[PDB]
């Protein structure tokens, strides 16, 4: 068990795979600054694209409680509809 | 585990929410001040869009029997119809 | 663990919901006259929207069974079909 | 435990419903004339709407093979879009 | 258990179906010809209709990797779209 | 329990059916250079068609991580809508 290998579900919400994230890394063989760095590449790096969307639309300079707070919405109702309707809307 | 760490799920029911943020604010080292001002910020702060939503619209002063009454029905049927109708309506 | 705290989930079926109902009603501390008013108000009063809505139509005067049997259709395709075709039709 | 109780979920297929219903049926206190008249009555009587549709379809004289055959594609995305077209079509 | 009551659900996907079959079939008292031919009668005999549309699609001389390979992709987005596509075309 | 047998389910994420096939490549009475063949043909050979279309898009000389990356999106929101639009605009 690896940290490279946490990959977000395409289901999963977003707030179980960084669960899954730090869990993995307080058990990785890595000094502090190495964990950090993790930090800022693979938990964005190995998100799912529906995610991917909204944390590339947060831009860099965004905390942690944004990103969530931003991709809560994820597979709700809310979010369904609206992805249907623009896919409806382009093609 | 902490109190703000608490957020719903986005398919996750209100209901469900509520609990585990009692059994948690139950199990916090905090007075009960401090606990009932946590009720009055976190409990709505950290919900998912969906029930956000329907919460600002019941606006301050309404007590928790009205918001879980009032949130109760998203997931459900006519919820996820009436979210997808607006949907496809506005674009 | 409360008889008033006995709310139906936006996914759950009725018939979940009144076994949870009586099996709590059975584990309260109140009279049997007590008990019957609870029956009478709460099991309806604390049921979904979706489920809320045929109960509403039934009017007063409805056994269990007719409640049940009215209600056992809720999330079905058919009703999921129905309710979102008429969703689409008034917006 | 009765069997009276034993109704069909919305979401249930049908030969789940069925096997409970058996399952409930040889652990009931009864005659085997009035276990096989509730096998005649109950077991069509307390089915969900989309089998019961199907169910009254087939009309009488239907073999038990033939009502879970008939039935066994509720659910399916062949019966959940054909009842969606309808659905749409004659609303 | 009895290798006659095997039979697919609607939501169940065909390996998994395929492998119940046989657990079920090392379990039968019958011979070996008796259990080949009970493979190749009641294993397709007893799937679900979304299923049997595929397999007769394959005819006979087909070999179970065919028949699984086919079958695989019932349930997914891919076949749901495709289906749901065809029922509002001919409705 | 065989490596000819993995084979992915129609909602099972990419993940999950690579993560099952390499644990039960472990398993496997073969030298190293049979178990990277294999490794070679069935894991692409045995996917669902959802993500073959995907991993059939990559083309050849695509590494494990750049196919994990590119199906990890099926069944999301996004892929479905996109997919079912799809299938909507040409039929
Ligand atoms: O009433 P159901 O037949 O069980 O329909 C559900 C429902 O789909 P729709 O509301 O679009 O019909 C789920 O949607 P949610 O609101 O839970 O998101 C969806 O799950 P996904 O969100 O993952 O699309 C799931 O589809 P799946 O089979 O892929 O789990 C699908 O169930 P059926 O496909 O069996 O209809």
Chains 1, 2, 3, 4, 5, 6 share one sequence.
Not at 14 to 21: G, M, N, T
Not at 31 to 40: A, D, F, G, I, Y
Not at 43 to 58: E, F, G, R, S
Request: proline share 5%; aromatic share 6%.
């Amino acid at each position: 068990t690896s940290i490279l290998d946490i990959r977000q579900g395409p289901k999963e919400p977003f707030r179980d795979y960084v669960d899954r994230f730090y869990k993995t890394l307080r058990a990785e063989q890595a000094s502090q600054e190495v964990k950090n760095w993790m930090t800022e590449t693979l938990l964005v790096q190995n998100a799912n694209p529906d995610c991917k969307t909204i944390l590339k639309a947060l831009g860099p300079a965004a905390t942690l409680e944004e990103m969530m707070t931003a991709c809560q919405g994820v597979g709700g109702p809310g979010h369904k509809a609206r992805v249907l309707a623009e896919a409806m809307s382009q093609v």
